[PDB]
């Protein structure tokens, strides 16, 4: 008498096809997916400080468009800009808009601090019907519209040192009147000028008179600029007309702050990884949801599926 001992390995009826170096498709016993390709559709409000901009863009919140007054001194980990946002104050452009948006977004705070600028010889707090705060005329809460005082507008020449141990962000501007009349009625000088400087930088902008498309009653415009003052440096504003002066500075922070465009609803949950399509889990190494991401996210990839084999080759007897 004899015995028979046979050696073998399992098989399953439901194989998975996988890719190797030598095969486009080969069946293994089991596999796991490595590409995250679905979202809940919603941005989890933890663990990042989410700040929904609703109808406001970050720039409008920064400047202080009335309907964006809610946002004064706010702070975010991730500011979410909605497509339904609209601007509703004096018409403006920011030369190099992307940059200002980026640098404020990365700072992560709108913390504003008023300073005692003295404007000798000019009317302050100009306002307009294009920018209503409450029922009567208004302006950007963080900007101060200067005009003539008693038929003269003298060469303004104010100073303001940085004596703190942190960087100051000044947002200022210049006014482009539509007509030659409007220029003189407001600033007396036929042609104005703003020069803002520190020991490091200097910027001179010369207003340019003419008509632009009608916005909220206006054919004129304001152009927004910015200056960062270093500890130990000093801001020098100097203008013989058309200055849209700052009221103070924004505090500049460094951290994990950013901004994102998304119309996805915020929601009470936890996800480390945000994408404009919503939050996504980050167990898998790759994702296919969106190249735009914030947080601890899988690497964006072109594939929508990558199977990693977790079992042997599958060879059923049938």
């Amino acid at each position: 008498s004899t015995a028979t001992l046979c050696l073998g390995h399992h098989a399953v009826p439901n194989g998975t096809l996988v890719k190797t170096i030598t095969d486009d498709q080969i069946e293994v016993t089991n596999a796991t997916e490595l590409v995250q390709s679905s979202s809940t559709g919603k941005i989890c409000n933890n663990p990042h400080r989410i700040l929904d901009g609703i109808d406001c863009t970050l720039i409008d919140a920064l400047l202080g468009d009335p309907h964006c007054d809610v946002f004064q001194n706010e702070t975010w980990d991730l500011f979410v800009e909605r497509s339904k946002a609209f601007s509703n104050c004096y018409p403006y452009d920011v030369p190099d808009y992307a940059s200002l948006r980026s640098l404020v977004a990365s700072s992560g705070t709108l913390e504003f601090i008023t300073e005692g600028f003295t404007w000798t010889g000019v009317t302050q707090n100009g306002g307009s019907n294009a920018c209503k705060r409450g029922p009567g005329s208004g302006f950007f809460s963080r900007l101060n519209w200067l005009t003539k005082s008693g038929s003269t507008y003298p060469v303004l020449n104010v100073t303001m040192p940085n004596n703190d141990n942190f960087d100051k962000l000044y947002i200022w501007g210049i006014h482009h009147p539509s007509t030659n009349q409007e220029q003189t009625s407001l600033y007396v000088q036929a042609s104005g000028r703003v020069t803002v400087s520190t020991r490091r930088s200097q910027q001179t902008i010369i207003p340019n008179i003419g008509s632009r498309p009608w916005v909220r009653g206006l054919s004129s415009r304001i152009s927004i600029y910015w200056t960062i003052v270093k500890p130990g440096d000093v801001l020098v504003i100097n203008s013989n007309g058309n200055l849209i002066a700052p009221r103070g500075y924004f505090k500049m922070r460094t951290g994990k702050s950013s901004i994102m465009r998304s119309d996805a609803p915020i929601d009470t949950c936890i996800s480390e990884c945000i994408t404009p399509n919503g939050s996504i889990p980050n167990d898998k190494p790759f994702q296919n949801v969106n190249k735009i991401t914030y947080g601890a996210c899988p690497k964006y990839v072109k594939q929508n599926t990558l199977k990693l084999a977790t079992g042997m080759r599958n060879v059923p007897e049938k």
Binding site: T2, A3, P13, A98, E272, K307, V315
Partner: protein, 172 residues
Amino acid sequence: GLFGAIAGFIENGWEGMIDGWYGFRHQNSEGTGQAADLKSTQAAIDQINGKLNRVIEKTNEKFHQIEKEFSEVEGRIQDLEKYVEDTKIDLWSYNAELLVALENQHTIDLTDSEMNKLFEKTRRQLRENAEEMGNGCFKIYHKCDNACIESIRNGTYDHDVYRDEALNNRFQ
């Protein structure tokens, strides 16, 4: 696979082995039987988990980056911003594609390897008491009851006990 065992000298797998990745089927005077080998099953699983834990570990985190969608045409800078991102993506996608290819080729090879290790382990135990029939099965050349079988399975088989009986059947 590199070792000739799975989808090799072993014709096929056993859909009926529901309690391990590897094992034995046998026939002695007491009837037929089946049993998983836990040590080898465990070897394959441990390695596969090691692989898996190493790929699924360590999402890096990124915060403020560049913009990646644009509302209007601008030219040079935006071209660059897009080229940079397009370049990053293609490289990551190549990485991802290659990673699964290598990983999967390897996984198939090591499980093939483990099947072959188990075969060799067993052949070694049986010494001169068994012959290989070349399909993954040994012909054991002595009476080998259920305790004998279990002893091969758990690596305590004593070839000396059955050597005379076996040599005699094998040659005379």
